[PDB]
Design a protein around this ligand. Structure first.
Ligand SMILES: [Cu+2]
Ligand SMILES: [Cu+2]
Lengths: 234, 234
């Protein structure tokens, strides 16, 4: 089971509590975070609004449910989740250390006709980050949704960005646990940007991963980053 | 980056089969340049019940081929090969790399032809996409199973992408994009993957594999780029 990270938000109208969910596992099926994984999510998910980044409270039936501190107004906001860095041993004969980090970012439009770009287009500081350059509410089927990929604050050229949606691939309860089939794939340009072309309406997840050398070679050797951006089309 | 694919005209029973060798950027057919003629030193092959036969290079442009004889209703293969070429590569050192490319097109002659006897048998391409079903039976959103073979054996964990003519067209030029894919997934332990087409049209599936060259005394690395073209819908 690969175990990737993404973020989901329920339909929220202005003035009520924004409920969100931390998906850790196989998209799009949410699952409770296991006992041996809790230390990985030591820091709660964050809500990004005009006042900035604020912590969310882990309230709900399951341990992956979060609720906003105060009610939220209409606008376009971000919900971010982080898999805190973990170290593990790998090989291939001269085993080595790898640091895994994962990030999830969800675009949430609180209120109909809300398609702001001021907040959602600003980088939030994730090691590997997908910054939307437009609001998904304006993107119809067949239109292009430009995003930028940033690694360590700089644009990432030639990075493979894939994208899928809930209901595209429907199989493999647990028999393979393989990564889901993608409905889109393309590489970023020199400015780190790529146009996602959605062919279906629904809840979409875009994904990018980068593997590189760890900065401090005297502590660890490799670093792997998996990042997703979740949004709505239509 | 030039790649190999095959296109076939709409063909009925009793007429010659016209096919085109695409060497370049899909789906723009281009004449094979003077300095590239030696690479395509063997003609495109037509695979039928009687096996593999050479096609005849007839037409205004040098990428155009016809079958030797009029073809009957059925399901046939048209294959093209970019013959192995060696080039030097630097990292710092210098090593030999052999490049080979393959293309295969499933062509149904007759409006009701959905045979599988010919198109599902491997042809012997070093890197090959073997269809396990006829695409004429595949409607939009259904699964089209293929297997990937490398040196005759199934190739697991290989990335297969797919796109169609007309998917990415914006601002295409001699120095631009339109490599965007409408599908991407990895093969399983049996080398099989289900392409899920979301639109009708002229589709191309692609896979590549970089490995060590067999005879390390002569060359070091090998790179294979392989295509499968087909029609979805009518
Ligand atoms: Cu509503
Ligand atoms: Cu016809």
């Amino acid at each position: 089971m690969v175990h990737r990270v993404w973020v989901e938000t329920a339909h929220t109208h202005g003035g009520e509590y924004l409920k969100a969910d931390l998906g850790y596992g196989e998209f799009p099926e949410l699952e409770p975070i296991a006992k041996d994984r809790l230390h990985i999510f030591s820091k709660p998910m964050q809500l990004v609004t005009e006042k900035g980044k604020e912590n969310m409270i882990q309230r709900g039936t399951y341990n992956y449910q979060y609720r906003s501190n105060r009610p939220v107004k209409d606008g376009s906001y971000l919900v971010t989740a982080e898999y805190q860095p973990t170290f593990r041993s790998k090989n291939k004969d001269a085993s080595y250390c790898e640091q895994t980090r994962m990030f999830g970012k969800n675009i949430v439009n609180v209120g109909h006709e809300s398609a702001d770009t001021a907040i959602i287009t600003k980088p939030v500081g994730q090691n590997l980050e997908i910054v939307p350059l437009d609001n998904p509410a304006n993107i119809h089927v067949g239109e292009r949704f430009k995003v930028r990929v940033l690694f360590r604050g700089e644009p990432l050229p030639n990075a493979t960005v894939t994208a899928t949606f809930d209901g595209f691939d429907t199989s493999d309860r647990s028999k393979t646990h393989k990564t889901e089939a993608q409905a889109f794939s393309d590489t970023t340009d020199g400015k780190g940007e790529v146009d996602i072309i959605p062919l279906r309406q629904g809840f979409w997840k875009a994904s990018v991963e980068y593997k590189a050398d760890f900065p401090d070679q005297s502590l660890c050797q490799k670093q792997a980053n998996y990042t997703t951006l979740t949004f709505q089309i239509g």
